[PDB]
Paper text:
We use the structure determination of the major pilin in type IV pili (TFP), PilA1, from Clostridioides difficile as a working example. Our attempts to determine the structure of a PilA1 construct lacking part of the N-terminal α1 helix to prevent self-polymerization are used here as an example of molecular-replacement approaches. Despite collecting high-resolution data for R20291 PilA1Δ1–34, it was not possible to calculate phases and an interpretable electron-density map using our manually edited search models based on known pilin structures. Previous knowledge of the biology and structure of TFP pilins, particularly the presence of a long, N-terminal α-helix required for pilus formation, allowed informed decisions to be made during the structure-determination strategy. The PilA1 structure was finally successfully determined using ARCIMBOLDO and the ab initio MR strategy used is described. ARCIMBOLDO uses a fragment-based method and harnesses the predicted secondary structure of the target sequence to place fragments as search models, in combination with powerful density-modification algorithms such as those implemented in SHELXE, to provide an initial trace model. As our example shows, using a careful approach to molecular-replacement pipelines and exploring available options, combined with prior knowledge of both the biology and structural characteristics of the protein of interest, can lead to solution of the phase problem and the determination of novel protein structures.
PilA1 is the major pilin of the type IV pili (TFP) system in this clinically important Gram-positive bacterium. TFP are the most widespread type of pili, and are uniquely found in both Gram-positive and Gram-negative species. PilA1 is thought to assemble into long pili filaments, which are decorated by the minor pilins.
Numbering used by the authors: 8 to 140
The structure:
Amino acid sequence: GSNINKAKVASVESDYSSVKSAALSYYSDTNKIPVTPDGQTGLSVLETYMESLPDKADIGGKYKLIKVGNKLVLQIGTNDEGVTLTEAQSAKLLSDIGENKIYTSVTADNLGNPLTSNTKVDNKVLYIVLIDN
């Protein structure tokens, strides 16, 4: 329960850090935000920059990269499966990553409701800002 759940959150944080470094490299080299091709999932857009591509989050859900306004966003989950978070998992993720990054909804233009330290997520797609311009 408690310790396993905290380590699943830490695993997403490690994936986030690795993907963020690779994304910044791609952005510096191409002058364009790396995005998953329309109609696909996964991080193969970053394959030149990563020895091993993260596939699924330990909290549930496949990874992909989307543009939301001017921001690069790590999407965690798809139609098939979203993330699951207890309040304690949400609290750790926010303590470690900080504010204005983790969202429970987006449109193509705008970040939606921010995750809070009291939020439970039951099989829903989650969003973490990687690059804020």
